[PDB]
Swiss-Prot record, chain D:
Gene label: RPL32
Record lineage: Eukaryota, Fungi, Dikarya, Ascomycota, Saccharomycotina
Key words of the record: Ribonucleoprotein, Ribosomal protein
Gene Ontology CC: cytosolic large ribosomal subunit
Molecular function GO terms recorded: structural constituent of ribosome
InterPro entries: Ribosomal_eL32, Ribosomal_eL32_CS, Ribosomal_eL32_sf
Gene Ontology biological process terms from the UniProt entry: translation
Family: Belongs to the eukaryotic ribosomal protein eL32 family.
Domain of life: Eukaryota
Name of the protein in its database record: Large ribosomal subunit protein eL32
Length: 159, 171, 51, 125, 185, 57, 57, 226
RNA sequence: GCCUAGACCGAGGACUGCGGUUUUUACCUAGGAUGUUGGCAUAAUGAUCUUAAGUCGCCCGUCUUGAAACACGGACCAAGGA
RNA sequence: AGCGUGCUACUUAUACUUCACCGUGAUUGCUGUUUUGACGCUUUCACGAGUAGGCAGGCGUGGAGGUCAGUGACGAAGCCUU
């Protein structure tokens, strides 16, 4: 007999972290979520109300609705050959702000500051990020660092 | 293969913690510098916590034979893998170049032990200065005084398919 | 209607690269280099021979 | 060539595309038919099987429809039919229909000779 | 061999000519093929494309749409261009004086336009008084108001019209349309 | 007698990638379906008053 | 049969301007007047003859 | 009428040639300057190596910034990710070559396609021979031979590329407009090597095959295939 | 940079372009073969048919994952036949 | 002419390169010279496997409206035929 219940296969996914069982620290209940916020979804096993389905465990989405104890999150799920918009109601214990926003918003602030200061100094600045480039030429000093010659070692048994 | 001896020098990439990492040199017998730098990283990752991604090649130089027209005897110390285990061995070769002795070694372990290039580590190639350093008789027999030998049964190669005279093998 | 190789056709070579004429006239392909007779490896770079 | 000058006429395939096993069976006529069978060696183009008609064998558009003498052949059934070839005597030749009587054919040959029109079948009856 | 990143030998998927064999529509396509090929006015390229369209892609334009387009700010004396039929609207209380160029006019539409002091001209008369489409305003009829579009994309919770021959209480109203009869979709 | 293949996902990603996998289109205004009724109710009055103020201005 | 049309002209276009300006023949270094030659073809094949002059043909 | 238009054409061509003389002087000067900087860079690197040798040091060369990638594998039986990678490198046939500017992103791209390509660091003469013999531009999604500097100017003149030597320089010294210049270049369609490959292509160059990075032997391979 | 041996091809069809040499509103090798000589037109040349030789070529149609199959229909031909 | 290994040359797929031709798709231009074909002419580039299946353009047959003032007992139709 096959079993395909709601929480099938969530034995380790919905477990609490080792030595992290019990009461929820209240910064979880003090965070503020607004419509449009990007939030990660991670089911907390100790709160069984408002719990996400196992598909959304590990997914990141957009807050679209704010209720008394919960947020509505928009997820895009692949169903066959396209994506379907899913609207999941989650209690805030299963939700955390996504850290990718604060990094991109910081690059936006930094670009605005650099551009305005470069305009003040009358020069130009290039704001596009660059991939790591091959390193340039260089001279390696050998004072105190004369090359040491290595050789492959013979075979030995150590048991 | 047809090989050259290379001096490959490399190091770990400098860090703010360690701005002058130690330089390591290896003598590599490779057909070209692409295999020379590959073999270098192959042995450094067997001997040090380093990778090609976290390291840097500093120098690749050909090491030419000092006396390419002086007949020498070389002792080569090897570490090769067989079908069953891993073995150390020492063998001797007569040649005028160190590279040509290593080339003979690779042919010889291919012929006598079915050991491919990938299964062989050259631990050491040493030119034996003293005649007493020669341990193996198959090369010790050419260090005798006033060595002479004929070449009986000479076979002459013909340009034509048919020959009008009886073959001979004098020489 | 017919592509002509500038590496074979001299007229196409001059049409594309007018500097090929100066390169040939000035012998840039066989230019001698004036320098001193030096050998900078006599010292520690003889670390190549042995180490 | 006595006609309007043309490039050398190339026929990519000069034989006849004969239907598979029109040599094996009398009931199978040589008229080309495409094999539709699931296992057919010809439909699957095994080495050694017959060539098959495809658009790659198409004739050069500049030499297409020209007989070896360089003319396009137009079928003529009466003397008034030669009137459409008056200004095309060096590119079009007239071919007299088989069902034209020996009398009307003599009249067509005489008028074609008068007009300078070439006749592809000038002898028959 | 080639590793094709797209499908080979694909037709554009757009009409390059009218499907119609009307010789006079072909003459209009001739005139605007020349204008689109030679005037640099985007109007002529739009008109040339619109002359290829099928009947459902050229919905009738009521004389009320024209009245509303002429009631745009600064558009009272523009030339209204309809590549299609202009129909009458007996719900208008009044119609202005306007110049309208169309493929066809109904008797009521043309009568009203001329009654109010306007002109009802063809697209060839348009090409002479406005060879670059100067001071024109293209008006298109509603495409999604067609009855066939009511049934497009029918499905559960889609709100479209079922394909049905009779209408009444006994025709597709019970189970699946009502919670008292099972479910509702 | 009638034992056949039970299940297979073979060829399913190929079929999904012939015409997919297409991301959904984004629009400036998402639908407010499923948004809290109390908020939606008040937001109606707020938009109506904003439109009146801009119209008068 | 397909009758000829009025637009099927019979006029022969002129050839384009050819850029094949001839340049003189370059003979082998061994062909010097007074050289004894061996004829390989023709009626006098196999005959040893004296070479005298290079004609403009 | 024909003779009248010939006189007008002759006058207009006189004026056009007079105007083009200045542009050709400009590109002549540019080509001479590029040659000078090539020679100076070569001598500078040689001098730096000699100086490091003299001063008990080791000059480490600058890592190559440019690579020429040749697809030496057919179009059958390719897994989806390297297949997509080869398509994004515009290597959609065997013996197709492209210039790639080395960064982390492009290096990680090439690593996925490594079992199907042979690539390396191209010399200036190799680049020049490729562009001269098999250089084509992408003009309105059509493959147009680079037979005249006007073709290059009309498509890359907004990027200060006015000549085939400007294009070659922009490729060789990986320039600020490398993206536009290399994408304007249609993928090079090379022949098979004159002399063949090694006995078995589809194994790394280090192991005696042909795929992967061969690093200066791409020039010998290109000499074979172009 | 220079010299040198051979093979395959000659699409296009007034001019127009880009260059080069300029002794020049001229010429060029520079937006695709011309010049010259011989032979032939009772024919050298081309096509097809028959046949030999070399090489390859299993019986079609069908159902099937898989048919030349030791799976099934088919002796032959005409007319009819979905 | 076996086994292990290295090297040089060489052989040849409907694959790759250059060129010719067919078709498909795209693309340049064409009305005071559009000029009795603009559903036409023309420039350029790329591409071509295919069962089930879809579509397009054509070949052929009996009969019908129109037209060729069409062929024909001075031989229609049919049939045989390197
Ligand atoms: Mg966990
Ligand atoms: Mg409960
Ligand atoms: Mg089959
Ligand atoms: Mg192909
Ligand atoms: Mg009923
Ligand atoms: Mg009930
Ligand atoms: Mg099944
Ligand atoms: Mg060869
Ligand atoms: Mg091989
Ligand atoms: Mg020709
Ligand atoms: Mg056989
Ligand atoms: Mg069956
Ligand atoms: Mg059955
Ligand atoms: Mg079975
Ligand atoms: Mg079968
Ligand atoms: Mg059997
Ligand atoms: Mg049976
Ligand atoms: Mg049965
Ligand atoms: Mg039977
Ligand atoms: Mg029948
Ligand atoms: Mg052997
Ligand atoms: Mg071949
Ligand atoms: Mg096909
Ligand atoms: Mg089929
Ligand atoms: Mg009937
Ligand atoms: Mg009669
Ligand atoms: Mg008869």
């Amino acid at each position: 007999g096959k079993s395909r219940g709601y929480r099938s296969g969530t034995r380790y996914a919905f477990q609490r972290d080792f030595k992290k069982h019990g009461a929820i620290p209240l910064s979880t209940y003090l965070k503020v979520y607004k419509v449009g916020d990007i939030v990660d979804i991670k089911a907390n096993g100790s709160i069984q109300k408002g719990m996400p389905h196992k598909y959304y465990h590990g997914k990141t989405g957009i807050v679209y609705n704010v209720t008394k104890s919960s947020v509505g999150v928009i997820i895009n799920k692949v169903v066959g050959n396209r994506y379907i918009e899913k609207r999941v109601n989650l209690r805030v214990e299963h939700v955390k702000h996504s850290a990718c926003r604060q990094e991109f918003l910081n690059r936006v602030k930094s670009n605005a500051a650099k551009k305005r200061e470069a305009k003040a100094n009358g020069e130009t600045v290039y704001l596009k990020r660059q991939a790591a480039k091959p390193r340039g030429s260089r001279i390696i000093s050998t004072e105190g660092n004369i090359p040491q010659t290595l050789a492959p070692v013979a075979y030995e048994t150590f048991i | 293969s047809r090989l050259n001896e290379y001096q490959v020098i490399g190091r770990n990439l400098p860090t703010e913690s360690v701005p002058e990492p130690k330089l390591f040199r290896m003598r590599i017998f490779a057909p070209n510098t692409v295999v020379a730098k590959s073999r270098y990283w192959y042995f450094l990752q067997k001997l040090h916590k380093v990778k090609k991604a976290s390291g840097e090649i500093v120098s690749v130089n050909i090491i030419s034979e000092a006396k390419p027209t002086k007949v020498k005897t070389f002792g080569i110390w090897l570490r090769y893998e067989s079908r069953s285990g891993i073995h150390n061995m020492y063998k001797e070769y007569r040649d005028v170049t160190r590279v040509g002795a290593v080339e003979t070694m690779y042919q010889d372990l291919a012929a006598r032990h079915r050991a491919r290039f990938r299964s062989i580590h050259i631990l050491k190639v040493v030119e034996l200065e003293k005649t007493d350093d020669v341990k193996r008789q198959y090369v010790k027999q050419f260090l005798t005084k006033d060595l002479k030998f004929p070449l009986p049964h000479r076979v002459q190669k013909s340009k034509k398919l048919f020959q009008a005279t009886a073959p001979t093998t004098f020489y | 209607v017919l592509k002509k190789n500038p590496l074979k056709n001299k007229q196409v070579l001059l049409r594309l690269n007018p500097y090929a004429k100066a390169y040939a006239a000035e012998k840039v392909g066989s230019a001698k280099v004036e320098q001193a007779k030096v050998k900078p490896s006599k010292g520690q770079f003889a670390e190549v021979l042995k180490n | 060539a006595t006609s309007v000058p043309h490039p050398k006429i190339v026929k990519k395939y000069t034989k006849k595309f004969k239907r598979h096993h029109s040599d094996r069976y009398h009931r199978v006529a040589e008229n080309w038919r495409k094999q539709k069978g699931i296992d057919s060696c010809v439909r699957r183009r095994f080495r050694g099987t017959i060539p098959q008609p495809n658009i790659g064998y198409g004739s050069n558009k500049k030499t297409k429809f020209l007989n070896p003498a360089g003319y396009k052949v137009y079928l003529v059934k009466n003397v008034k039919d030669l009137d459409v070839l008056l200004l095309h005597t060096k590119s079009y030749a007239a071919e007299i229909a088989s069902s034209v009587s020996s009398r009307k054919r003599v009249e067509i040959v005489a008028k074609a000779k008068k007009l300078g029109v070439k006749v592809t079948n000038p002898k028959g009856k | 061999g080639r590793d094709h990143t797209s499908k080979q030998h694909v037709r554009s998927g757009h009409r390059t000519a009218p499907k119609s064999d009307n010789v006079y529509l072909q003459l209009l396509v001739k005139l605007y093929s020349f204008l689109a090929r030679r005037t640099d006015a985007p109007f002529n390229k739009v008109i040339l494309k619109s002359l290829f369209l099928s009947k459902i892609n050229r919905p009738p334009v009521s004389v009320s749409r024209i009245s509303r387009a002429l009631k745009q700010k600064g558009a009272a004396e523009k030339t209204i261009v309809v590549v299609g039929t202009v129909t009458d609207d007996n719900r208008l209380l009044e119609f202005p004086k306007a110049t309208i160029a169309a493929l066809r006019f109904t008797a009521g539409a043309k009568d009203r336009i001329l009654k109010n002091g306007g002109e009802a001209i063809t697209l060839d008369q348009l090409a002479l008084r406005a060879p670059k489409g100067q001071n024109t305003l293209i008006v298109r009829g509603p495409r999604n108001s067609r009855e066939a579009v009511r049934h497009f994309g029918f499905g559960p919770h889609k709100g479209k019209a079922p394909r049905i021959l009779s209408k009444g209480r006994k025709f597709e109203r019970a189970r699946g349309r009502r919670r008292s009869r099972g479910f509702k979709v | 007698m009638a034992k056949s293949k039970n299940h297979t996902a073979h060829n399913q990603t190929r079929k999904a990638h012939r015409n997919g996998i297409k991301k959904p289109k984004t629009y400036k205004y998402p639908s407010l379906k499923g948004v809290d009724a109390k908020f939606k109710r008040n937001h109606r009055y707020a938009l109506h008053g904003t439109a009146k103020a801009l119209a008068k201005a | 049969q397909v009758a000829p049309k009025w637009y099927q002209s019979e006029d022969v276009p002129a050839p384009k301007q050819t850029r094949k300006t001839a340049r003189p023949q370059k003979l082998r270094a061994s062909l010097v007047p007074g050289t004894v030659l061996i004829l390989l073809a023709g009626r006098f094949r196999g005959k040893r003859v004296v070479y005298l002059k290079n004609l403009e043909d | 009428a024909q003779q009248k238009t010939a006189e007008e054409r002759a006058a207009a061509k006189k004026v056009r040639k007079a105007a083009n003389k200045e542009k050709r002087k400009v590109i002549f000067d540019r080509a001479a300057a590029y040659q000078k900087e090539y020679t100076e860079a070569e001598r500078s690197v040689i001098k730096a190596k000699r100086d490091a040798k003299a001063s008990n040091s080791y000059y480490v060369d600058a890592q190559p910034k440019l690579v020429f990638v040749v697809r030496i594998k057919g179009i059958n039986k390719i897994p989806p990710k390297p297949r997509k990678v080869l398509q994004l490198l515009r290597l959609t046939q065997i013996n197709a070559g492209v210039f790639v500017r080395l960064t982390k992103a492009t290096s990680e791209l090439i690593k996925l396609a490594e079992p199907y390509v042979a690539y390396g660091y191209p010399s200036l003469s190799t680049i020049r021979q490729l562009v001269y013999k098999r250089g084509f531009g992408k003009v309105n999604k059509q493959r147009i031979a680079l037979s005249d500097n006007a073709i290059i100017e009309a498509n890359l003149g907004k990027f200060n590329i006015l000549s085939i030597e400007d294009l070659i320089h922009e490729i060789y010294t990986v320039g600020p407009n490398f993206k536009q210049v290399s994408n304007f270049l249609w993928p090079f369609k090379l022949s098979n090597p004159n002399g063949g490959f090694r006995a078995r292509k589809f194994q790394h160059f280090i192991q005696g095959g042909d795929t992967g990075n061969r690093e200066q032997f791409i020039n010998a391979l290109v000499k074979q295939m172009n």
